[PDB]
Amino acid sequence: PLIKELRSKGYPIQFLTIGAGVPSLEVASEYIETLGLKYLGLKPGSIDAISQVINIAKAHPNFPIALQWTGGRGGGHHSFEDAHTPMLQMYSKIRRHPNIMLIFGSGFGSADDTYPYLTGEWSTKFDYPPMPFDGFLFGSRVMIAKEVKTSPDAKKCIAACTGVPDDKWEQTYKKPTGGIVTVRSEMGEPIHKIATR
Amino acid sequence: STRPLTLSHGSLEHVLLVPTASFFIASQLQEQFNKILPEPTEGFAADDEPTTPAELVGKFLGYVSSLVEPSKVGQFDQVLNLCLTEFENCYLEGNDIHALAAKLLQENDTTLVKTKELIKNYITARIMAKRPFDKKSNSALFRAVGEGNAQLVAIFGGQGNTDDYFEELRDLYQTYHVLVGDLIKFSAETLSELIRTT
Amino acid sequence: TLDINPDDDYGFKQEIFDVTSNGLKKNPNWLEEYHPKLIKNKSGKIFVETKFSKLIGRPPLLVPGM
Amino acid sequence: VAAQFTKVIDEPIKSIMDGIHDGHIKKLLHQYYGDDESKIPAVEYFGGESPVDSEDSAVFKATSSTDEESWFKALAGSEINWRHASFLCSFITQDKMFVSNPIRKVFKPSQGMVVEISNGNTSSKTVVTLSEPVQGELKPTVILKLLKENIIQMEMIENRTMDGKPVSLPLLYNFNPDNGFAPISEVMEDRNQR
Numbered sequence: 001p002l003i004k005e006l007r008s009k010g011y012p013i014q015f016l017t018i019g020a021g022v023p024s025l026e027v028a029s030e031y032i033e034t035l036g037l038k039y040l041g042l043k044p045g046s047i048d049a050i051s052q053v054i055n056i057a058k059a060h061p062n063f064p065i066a067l068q069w070t071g072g073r074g075g076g077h078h079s080f081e082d083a084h085t086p087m088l089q090m091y092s093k094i095r096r097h098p099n100i101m102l103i104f105g106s107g108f109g110s111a112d113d114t115y116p117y118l119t120g121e122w123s124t125k126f127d128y129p130p131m132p133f134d135g136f137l138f139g140s141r142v143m144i145a146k147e148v149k150t151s152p153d154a155k156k157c158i159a160a161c162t163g164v165p166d167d168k169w170e171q172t173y174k175k176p177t178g179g180i181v182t183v184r185s186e187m188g189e190p191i192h193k194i195a196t197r
Numbered sequence: 198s199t200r201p202l203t204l205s206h207g208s209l210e211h212v213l214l215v216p217t218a219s220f221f222i223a224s225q226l227q228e229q230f231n232k233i234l235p236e237p238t239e240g241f242a243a244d245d246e247p248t249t250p251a252e253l254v255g256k257f258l259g260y261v262s263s264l265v266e267p268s269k270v271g272q273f274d275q276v277l278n279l280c281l282t283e284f285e286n287c288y289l290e291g292n293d294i295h296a297l298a299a300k301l302l303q304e305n306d307t308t309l310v311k312t313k314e315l316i317k318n319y320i321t322a323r324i325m326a327k328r329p330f331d332k333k334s335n336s337a338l339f340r341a342v343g344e345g346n347a348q349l350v351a352i353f354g355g356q357g358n359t360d361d362y363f364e365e366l367r368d369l370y371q372t373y374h375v376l377v378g379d380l381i382k383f384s385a386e387t388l389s390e391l392i393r394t395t
Numbered sequence: 396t397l398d399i400n401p402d403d404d405y406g407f408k409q410e411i412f413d414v415t416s417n418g419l420k421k422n423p424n425w426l427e428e429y430h431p432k433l434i435k436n437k438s439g440k441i442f443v444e445t446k447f448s449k450l451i452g453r454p455p456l457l458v459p460g461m
Numbered sequence: 462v463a464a465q466f467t468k469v470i471d472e473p474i475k476s477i478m479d480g481i482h483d484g485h486i487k488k489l490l491h492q493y494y495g496d497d498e499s500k501i502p503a504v505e506y507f508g509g510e511s512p513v514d515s516e517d518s519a520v521f522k523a524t525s526s527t528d529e530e531s532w533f534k535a536l537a538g539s540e541i542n543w544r545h546a547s548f549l550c551s552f553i554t555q556d557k558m559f560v561s562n563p564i565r566k567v568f569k570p571s572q573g574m575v576v577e578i579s580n581g582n583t584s585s586k587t588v589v590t591l592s593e594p595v596q597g598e599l600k601p602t603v604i605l606k607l608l609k610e611n612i613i614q615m616e617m618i619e620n621r622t623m624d625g626k627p628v629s630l631p632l633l634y635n636f637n638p639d640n641g642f643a644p645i646s647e648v649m650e651d652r653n654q655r
C-alpha cells in the first residue's frame with residue numbers, strides 16, 4: 001500500500017525487491033501492474049524458486065524482472081545451496097525469457113573475483129559453455145564503508161575476519177570458519193554472523 | 198469461363214472454380230466423393246472427417262489420385278492438374294506442404310494422423326499428375342548454406358532410442374509411398390537375397 | 396518426425412523445407428548475445444553495458460537491502 | 462566468502478563501487494578493445510532500453526488501428542538524442558518526483574492526427590509538428606524542438622480563441638543527458654505564470 005500511495009504521488013521509487021521467498025503468480029501480478037515500478041526484484045533460494053521467477057516473467061513478458069541470484073555462501077539469512085550448481089542447471093531456461101536481467105551475488109568484493117561472471121568464463125571451469133551475467137550485488141563487502149552507521153569497533157571486528165574461499169564456506173554450520181558461523185534465527189532460518197562471544 | 202463447384206462437408210466448405218469445358222467430369226467426382234466421406238460430428242472430432250477447408254481439398258486430391266492410371270492418359274487428369282493449382286495458390290503460398298501441416302497443428306485442432314493424411318494426399322497427387330519435384334525449392338536453410346550464413350551436419354542414430362522403431366518405417370511407407378516405395382522394395386529384395394546366399 | 400516443440404529449443408522437418416525466415420532459426424550462442432560491452436556518454440563517462448545497466452542507466456553493480 | 466575482501470575501514474562508498482566498476486573497464490578494454498578508448502562507441506545518454514527488443518523530412522498519418530509502439534519508435538527515430546528521450550523515456554522528472562511523460566500522452570495516436578518531422582537528420586534543428594482537424598480544416602496544434610542547447614520547448618497551440626489569431630503555451634523541459642534513466646525534467650519556475 002505505502003509504495004502504491006507514494007508512487008502515485010510520484011516519489012522516485014525505481015524498483016521494489018522482495019527478499020526471503022518469491023510471491024505466487026497472482027500476487028506478483030498485483031505488484032507488477034498496480035505499483036508504478038520500472039522493475040521488480042526477486043531473490044530465489046532453490047531451483048524450485050528460480051522456476052517460480054520464470055513463471056512470473058512468462059506471464060508479463062514486457063515487464064523487466066531482476067532475478068537476484070545469491071548462494072548459501074552469502075551474509076545474513078542464507079539458503080543451503082551452492083552458488084554455481086543451480087545456475088548451470090537453470091541458466092538456459094532463464095535466458096529463454098529476455099525480460100529477466102540475471103544478477104549474481106554472494107561472495108564478491110573486487111573487480112578481479114567478479115570479472116569471470118561478467119565475461120561468462122566462470123562456467124568454463126565446470127566444462128559448460130560461457131554463461132555470462134548482467135550485474136553483481138555486494139552486501140557484506142560494503143559494511144565497512146565510511147557512510148554506513150555500523151559502529152567504529154564493529155568495523156574493526158569485521159576487518160579482522162580473514163574469511164574463507166568458496167570450497168570451505170559450508171564449515172560455518174559446524175564451527176567458526178574465517179571468524180564466521182551459521183546460527184538459527186527465531187524462525188529456524190540459518191544466518192551467517194561474525195563469531196563473537 | 199469457370200462454374201463454381203462447392204466441395205463441402207457439413208459446416209465448412211471450399212469453392213472450386215472449374216473450367217466449364219471439364220465441368221461434366223468434375224461434377225461426376227463431386228457426387229462420388231460426397232457420399233464416401235462420413236457425416237459431421239460437432240467440431241469434427243472423428244478420424245475420417247477433415248477439420249479445415251485445406252484438409253477437405255486434401256481428402257479430394259487423395260480420392261482423385263486413386264482413380265488415375267500413372268501411364269494411361271485417363272479422363273480425370275485435367276481435373277487433378279487444376280485441383281492442385283487451386284490447392285497450391287490458396288493454402289500453399291509458395292511454401293512447402295510440411296509448413297502448412299505445422300500451421301494446422303498449432304492454429305486449428307487437427308491431430309498428427311489427420312495431417313500426415315493431408316501430406317500423403319498432396320505428395321501422392323503431384324506424382325500421379327506427372328508434375329514431379331525437379332525445382333530446387335527455395336528452402337531458407339539451404340539459401341543460407343549456399344551464401345555461407347550456415348554450416349550443416351547430418352547425424353544418424355542407432356539402437357536404444359525407441360521400443361518400436363518399426364512404426365517409424367510403417368509411417369514412412371504409408372505417407373511417402375511414392376518417393377520411398379522403390380527403396381523399401383529394393384531393400385527387401387537385397388535382404389531376402391542376402392539370407393538365401395548366406 | 397513432424398511435430399511442434401513448444402519451447403522451440405530444436406526444430407522438426409518443417410524447418411528443412413520452410414521458405415520464409417521461419418526456416419533459418421538460430422539458437423542463441425550465450426557468449427555473443429550477452430557479451431559485456433563498453434559505451435560512453437556525451438560527457439565521456441565509460442559504462443559497462445549489460446542487459447541490466449542498459450535499463451537503469453547506471454553501472455551494473457547494486458548494494459542490496461541489508 | 463565475502464569476508465576475504467573486507468579489509469580497509471572507512472573507505473568512502475564512492476571509492477569502493479567506482480573501484481570495482483573501473484576495475485571491470487580496465488579489464489574489458491584490454492581484452493576486447495585493445496587498450497584504446499577511441500574504439501568505445503559513444504552515445505548521447507546511456508539508459509532506459511527495456512531488455513525485451515535515416516529519413517530527413519517524414520510524415521506519419523495515424524489511423525484508429527496504428528500500434529502505439531510502432532508509432533512512438535517512428536517519431537523518436539534511430540539516433541539517441543533529445544527526440545528519442547522525448548518519445549520513449551517512460552516518465553520525466555518534476556523537482557524530485559517522476560510524472561508520466563506528457564510528450565507521450567499528447568502524441569498518443571488516434572484517427573485524424575498527422576505528425577510532420579523537419580530536419581530529422583540533425584537533432585540541433587529537428588522540429589516535430591502535430592496537426593489535427595480544427596473546424597474541418599487541418600492546423601498545427603503541438604511543436605517540439607530545441608531553443609537553447611538543453612531546453613525542449615513543446616508549444617501547445619489553441620486555434621479557437623477570441624480574435625481568431627492562435628495562442629501558444631510554451632511548456633519547457635531541461636534535457637540533461639548525464640541522467641541516463643530520466644534525462645527530461647520539466648522547468649517548474651514560472652510554469653503557473655506561463
Ligand SMILES: Cc1cc2nc3c(=O)[nH]c(=O)nc-3n(C[C@H](O)[C@H](O)[C@H](O)COP(=O)(O)O)c2cc1C
Nearest residue numbers: 019070074075076106107138139140459460461463
Ligand atoms: C548484514 C546483512 C544484512 C542483510 N539483510 C538482508 C535483508 O534484510 N533482506 C534480504 O533480503 N537480504 C539481506 N541480506 C542478504 C544480502 O541482501 C545479500 O543476499 C548478501 O549480502 C550477498 O552476499 P554477500 O553478503 O556475501 O555479498 C543481508 C546480508 C547482510 C550481510
